[PDB]
Design an enzyme around this catalytic site. Structure first.
Site, PDB file in Angstrom:
ATOM      1  N   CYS A 132       0.848  -1.187   0.000  1.00  0.00           N
ATOM      2  CA  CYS A 132       0.000   0.000   0.000  1.00  0.00           C
ATOM      3  C   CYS A 132       0.893   1.250   0.000  1.00  0.00           C
ATOM      4  O   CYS A 132       2.023   1.209   0.512  1.00  0.00           O
ATOM      5  CB  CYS A 132      -0.855  -0.021   1.268  1.00  0.00           C
ATOM      6  SG  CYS A 132      -1.992   1.373   1.429  1.00  0.00           S
ATOM      7  N   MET A 146       1.391  -3.574   5.583  1.00  0.00           N
ATOM      8  CA  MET A 146       0.556  -3.545   4.397  1.00  0.00           C
ATOM      9  C   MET A 146       1.373  -3.757   3.127  1.00  0.00           C
ATOM     10  O   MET A 146       1.548  -2.859   2.274  1.00  0.00           O
ATOM     11  CB  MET A 146      -0.312  -2.282   4.347  1.00  0.00           C
ATOM     12  CG  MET A 146      -1.557  -2.595   3.542  1.00  0.00           C
ATOM     13  SD  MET A 146      -2.894  -1.410   3.753  1.00  0.00           S
ATOM     14  CE  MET A 146      -3.926  -1.932   2.379  1.00  0.00           C
ATOM     15  N   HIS A 302      20.516 -12.823   8.496  1.00  0.00           N
ATOM     16  CA  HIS A 302      21.819 -13.059   9.120  1.00  0.00           C
ATOM     17  C   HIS A 302      22.495 -11.820   9.716  1.00  0.00           C
ATOM     18  O   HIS A 302      23.707 -11.811   9.924  1.00  0.00           O
ATOM     19  CB  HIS A 302      22.752 -13.898   8.214  1.00  0.00           C
ATOM     20  CG  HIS A 302      23.712 -14.771   8.974  1.00  0.00           C
ATOM     21  ND1 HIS A 302      24.739 -14.266   9.747  1.00  0.00           N
ATOM     22  CD2 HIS A 302      23.796 -16.118   9.072  1.00  0.00           C
ATOM     23  CE1 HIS A 302      25.432 -15.266  10.263  1.00  0.00           C
ATOM     24  NE2 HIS A 302      24.875 -16.397   9.871  1.00  0.00           N
TER      25      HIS A 302
HETATM   26 CU   LIG Z   1      -2.883   1.048   3.415  1.00  0.00          CU
HETATM   27 CU   LIG Z   2      25.702 -18.301  10.256  1.00  0.00          CU
END
Ligand SMILES: [Cu+2]
Ligand SMILES: [Cu+2]
Ligand SMILES: [Cu+2]
Ligand SMILES: [Cu+2]
Ligand SMILES: [Cu+2]
Ligand SMILES: [Cu+2]
Lengths: 335, 335, 335
Positions: A132, A146, A302
């Site tokens: 959105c 959203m 990570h």
């Molecule tokens: Cu929205």
């Molecule tokens: Cu790792």
């Protein structure tokens, strides 16, 4: 031409909630189709951690992330988007897969009590974010959850860098969400009566560029435990990952990305043998892996602080037989 | 040899202010040239937002970013760099495109009232950052806006990954600047009578690694309203983007990057069909796009907090006819 | 089979401290081998900056980063990992190069007084991060320095994107570390007399996602001044760089990355002519460069705040003759 488009087959699809994906075929069945989806927008309070922290989510189809829509290159995606009168805010949709009108945003602004139908041609193959984007309040909607993704498969399905077919046995969609939850002076997360009440406090947190939470499928631990994703040794899995606002760096702990379209675009040849891939904020990527070992895997962003402290960690539970060639404990832990 | 270099033709170029680019040819006309540029450094107060927030900028050619210099591979770039006596700081220049002496930094340290001339062979094709880097004061100069980019075109102009010529109709250079502006206890931005007065307070903000402002062409909205970039349906536009200090993730809202040299280097095949590309801090990148739809486009860093709250958003106004095959409103927002 | 593996040659390799790398052949000597390494884990105070700031390091082989282990594709890496009684914590090891049991983490959990022997088949060529990851304590061990990298060479050495051989004369390994050191009420870094005493305070800093220090080879200046890496004009150098937790963007100031495996994976063709490359947190990358100019080069994380303010800077000192064709001071700084 006019008649050509008019004469194309139309097909309705029932959506499924992430991380699962609706019915589709990897190879396109025949010629171009108009693939029809409907999503109702739900504003609602969700709990995002095990401390009971609440966000007023703004959720396509009632979920964070919104569901994965799947079509093929040069199909048309035709979305009916519905904003019920029970909602408080105007909403729209920007499909990064689409061309024109701010991805569709300029054509889909719907107040509570309104609906709209947008069609676009899926001209470019890949996984793509949608989100959105109401003028003047774009990030607030996006970081309130959203956003989702779509996948535009090549008509011939996926291929490696040599044009050899890559066919997955299953697919999962991991949507990653940075949340910015206001806290009081005592460090306790705040609750608000209505979405708008939280606006000023939330933007202040947003401006720190430091999420309070970074989560998969809308909450800490959403894809762990009994809700871990699953596979078997020998199984080929595609993992679609999106982040509409902020960078991420996915890693399958104990695995690899055998083929990773890190840019998410299928005409860009995939990287291979990846340890940790990188998806910039505002994009989706896709990783293809064939499981070789059984056991629990963790799938993480990570930055391990984000993964382990902020919530960006999922699990896979993989069945099958251990492969002692690939790995063995020659001497188990002992004094 | 010096003799062969002295025999080469000279071309003195008049630089233009970003986002525009000085006149050039995509395909090199003739053999290698010594291309001459002159820039005067201006330490100047600039206003970076609509509230009136001020920064003491350090500005190559008086602009933030510095202007884009364009040469071809194996041309020599010969820069006359002037630090007028009205300035108070020592400056230099580091060209990422150059080889040796800290990119030229080691050979171009000039005090107020000094000038220098640096020549370097542009051996590698691509877009490249340049920036000031004075010993012990490097980030302060760079994040005070003392940076820009150059483009080293292949002698045969641009090509895609596969030998197809890519010829742009127009080019724009978007320089993105992270600024770190001190605030008072009431959260209002501080003003300083002298640049030096700002230093300690600015390093404190720099340490948070969280810019207060992230802007294109030196200010919030600098490339919006009547300063929007322009194009037409069917027009091929190259967008060069730089960020000398901090990562960015450019996205054309409503569009794509048809070909993106995300690393900025033309011998590295471009990514294709991109939604959102990634340029790491200290690099330039370039995206090539053929517009297919008329209307307003936003061009943003797609951390939408950085775009919409911190300033990293520009506009394109595109003229022409709407393509309903690519996108149509089947049902406009309605009850 | 287990029998076939048991019958392969065993080689005992002796590890050297970063940034140096143990003796190896680029092209594989004979068929697959079981390459044997041993590392003792050392918990010690390290001083990381000129203000006497201390970290409780958790160091593989007593160094931060841990040493680079070099094998060839389809060799077996057999690591003996020892956790002495002088240590206070449980530790393990996750090799991103390995397949199964969370990279080896699940099989290598050793208390103080314990040791373990892990073997895995190095099936994928590339540079790969390794790190400790004890259940419930993962980011804490990683950001205390418990990480390094390995290199799995193609049996036929390195090649460019077109299988043309690339042979380095020198190899260096740069480990980049984000540290999160707690401060008292006056902004002074805190000292502790046991690693456990710092835990709570550190977790609070970690959650800001803003490192207090970002360093190479475990401290500010560890690879500058006298401890600069060395090369000569004409020498081909491979620079391996890892970051187990957080993104980085390496840049050789005055140079380039002629070939860069930015993802670290050798079956992914390298980017070329790089100015600044990008390595996501949780990964290693590698850059190949042939020096053409003598002098001091700085090698930095090109977020210049991170380099110049937080510590992420190294030097190369390069011997040889200046090349005036590449770069010349036409006019030295003058009034
Ligand atoms: Cu929205
Ligand atoms: Cu790792
Ligand atoms: Cu977007
Ligand atoms: Cu300067
Ligand atoms: Cu630089
Ligand atoms: Cu450990």
């Amino acid at each position: 031409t006019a008649a050509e488009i008019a004469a194309l087959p139309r097909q309705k699809v029932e959506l499924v909630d992430p991380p699962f994906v609706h019915a589709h075929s990897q190879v396109a069945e025949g010629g171009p189709k108009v693939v029809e989806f409907t999503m109702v927008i739900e504003e609602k309070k969700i709990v995002i951690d095990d401390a009971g922290t609440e966000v007023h989510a703004m959720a396509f189809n009632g979920t964070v992330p919104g569901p994965l829509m799947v079509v093929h290159q040069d199909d048309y995606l035709e979305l009916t988007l519905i904003n019920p009168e029970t909602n408080t805010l105007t909403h729209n949709i920007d499909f990064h897969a689409a061309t024109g009108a701010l991805g569709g945003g300029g054509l889909t602004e719907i107040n509570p009590g309104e609906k709209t139908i947008l069609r676009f041609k899926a001209t470019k193959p890949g996984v793509f974010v949608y989100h959105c984007a109401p003028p003047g309040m774009v990030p607030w909607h996006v970081v309130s959850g959203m956003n989702g993704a779509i996948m535009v498969l090549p008509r011939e399905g996926l291929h490696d860098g040599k044009g050899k077919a890559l066919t997955y046995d299953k697919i999962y969609y991991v949507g990653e969400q940075d949340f910015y939850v206001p806290r009081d002076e005592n460090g306790k997360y705040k609750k608000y009566e209505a979405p708008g009440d939280a606006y000023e406090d939330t933007v202040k947190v947003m401006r720190t560029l430091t999420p309070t939470h970074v989560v998969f499928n809308g909450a800490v631990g959403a894809l762990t435990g009994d809700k871990a994703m699953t596979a078997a040794v020998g199984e080929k899995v595609l993992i679609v990952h999106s982040q509409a606002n902020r960078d991420t760096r996915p890693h399958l702990i104990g695995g690899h990305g055998d083929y990773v379209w890190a840019t998410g675009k299928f005409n860009t040849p995939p990287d291979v043998d990846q340890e940790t891939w990188f998806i910039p904020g505002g994009a989706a990527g896709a990783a293809f892996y064939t499981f070789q070992q059984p056991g629990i895997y963790a799938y993480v962003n990570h930055n391990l602080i984000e993964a382990c402290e902020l919530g960006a960690a999922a699990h896979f539970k993989v069945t099958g037989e251990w492969n002692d060639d690939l790995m063995t404990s020659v001497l188990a832990p002992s004094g």
